[PDB]
């Protein structure tokens, strides 16, 4: 099983998009990452990738 399982290769894309734009409207990032809805992008980042 692997419901919407994420991979490091994908995390790099999400990271780059977040660094480029920001943790603003996740809809923008989601638009650039098909399948990965704003919920997926937001969760994957704010809930895991958050260097702070």
Curated annotation (Swiss-Prot):
<comment type="subunit">
    <text>Binds to HIPK1. Interacts with HIPK2, MAF, MYBBP1A and NLK.</text>
</comment>
<protein>
    <recommendedName>
        <fullName>Transcriptional activator Myb</fullName>
    </recommendedName>
</protein>
<comment type="function">
    <text>Transcriptional activator; DNA-binding protein that specifically recognize the sequence 5'-YAAC[GT]G-3'. Plays an important role in the control of proliferation and differentiation of hematopoietic progenitor cells.</text>
</comment>
<feature type="domain" description="HTH myb-type 1">
    <location>
        <begin position="1"/>
        <end position="49"/>
    </location>
</feature>
<feature type="DNA-binding region" description="H-T-H motif">
    <location>
        <begin position="26"/>
        <end position="49"/>
    </location>
</feature>
